Design a protein around this motif. Sequence first.
Motif, PDB file in Angstrom:
ATOM      1  N   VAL A   1       0.649  -0.567  -0.023  1.00 38.78           N
ATOM      2  CA  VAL A   1      -0.233  -0.319  -0.478  1.00 38.78           C
ATOM      3  C   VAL A   1       1.200   1.304   0.114  1.00 38.78           C
ATOM      4  N   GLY A   2       0.802   2.138  -1.122  1.00 36.00           N
ATOM      5  CA  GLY A   2       1.036   3.312  -1.149  1.00 36.00           C
ATOM      6  C   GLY A   2       1.048   4.869  -0.195  1.00 36.00           C
ATOM      7  N   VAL A   3       1.514   4.903   0.361  1.00 38.34           N
ATOM      8  CA  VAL A   3       0.967   6.349   0.941  1.00 38.34           C
ATOM      9  C   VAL A   3       1.330   7.223   0.812  1.00 38.34           C
TER      10      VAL A   3
ATOM     11  N   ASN B   1      -2.343  11.136   3.227  1.00 42.31           N
ATOM     12  CA  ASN B   1      -3.211   9.893   2.394  1.00 42.31           C
ATOM     13  C   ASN B   1      -2.768   9.312   1.836  1.00 42.31           C
ATOM     14  N   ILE B   2      -3.946   8.039   0.575  1.00 37.24           N
ATOM     15  CA  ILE B   2      -3.627   6.805   0.066  1.00 37.24           C
ATOM     16  C   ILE B   2      -3.443   7.068  -1.697  1.00 37.24           C
TER      17      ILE B   2
ATOM     18  N   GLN C   1      -3.029  -1.241  -4.728  1.00 36.95           N
ATOM     19  CA  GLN C   1      -2.465  -2.521  -5.724  1.00 36.95           C
ATOM     20  C   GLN C   1      -1.130  -2.577  -6.689  1.00 36.95           C
ATOM     21  N   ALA C   2       0.025  -2.014  -5.458  1.00 39.48           N
ATOM     22  CA  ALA C   2       1.435  -1.333  -6.028  1.00 39.48           C
ATOM     23  C   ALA C   2       1.542  -3.167  -5.580  1.00 39.48           C
ATOM     24  N   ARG C   3       1.717  -4.404  -4.939  1.00 37.82           N
ATOM     25  CA  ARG C   3       2.204  -5.462  -4.874  1.00 37.82           C
ATOM     26  C   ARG C   3       1.694  -5.841  -6.757  1.00 37.82           C
TER      27      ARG C   3
ATOM     28  N   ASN D   1      -4.887   4.627  -7.478  1.00 39.14           N
ATOM     29  CA  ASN D   1      -5.550   3.698  -7.873  1.00 39.14           C
ATOM     30  C   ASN D   1      -6.258   3.887  -9.204  1.00 39.14           C
ATOM     31  N   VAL D   2      -6.329   4.572  -8.869  1.00 39.50           N
ATOM     32  CA  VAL D   2      -7.503   4.826  -9.956  1.00 39.50           C
ATOM     33  C   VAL D   2      -7.021   6.321 -10.783  1.00 39.50           C
TER      34      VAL D   2
END
Length: 145
Positions: A113-115, A121-122, A126-128, A144-145
């Motif tokens: 998870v990237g923050v 903020n997130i 889905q960085a895996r 993400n989006v």
Amino acid sequence: SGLKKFFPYSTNVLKGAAADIALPSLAGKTVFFYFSASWCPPCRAFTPQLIDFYKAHAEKKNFEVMLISWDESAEDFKDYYAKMPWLALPFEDRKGMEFLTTGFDVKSIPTLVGVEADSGNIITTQARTMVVKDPEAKDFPWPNV
């Protein structure tokens, strides 16, 4: 805001063997929380892929990785964290691990998870898949989006 609200029970986190760091040290970076354990097969296979990625781009892309462990014991945690070059929430802070695990709704590992450290903020849960799919970090940090 900042990284503070992710760590209700920890002040410093580990940076290898046996030292500990302050959150303000991550100022200006993206921080990945990496939910993983040594008992989980795909974790054992993804860790080396993420270490490869981190060596290639942590400095240039300005990010840090924090192990958020699901290991079963203090000894498992140590042996597994030993192989990694980045940070870790201390294994004693089990409740902390649960707060981020429920916080990001991680249901299976590995998950990364990237923050943003400064705003808190997130970026994405889905960085895996992205470390694998974009090894050259062309679309990093993969909002993400």
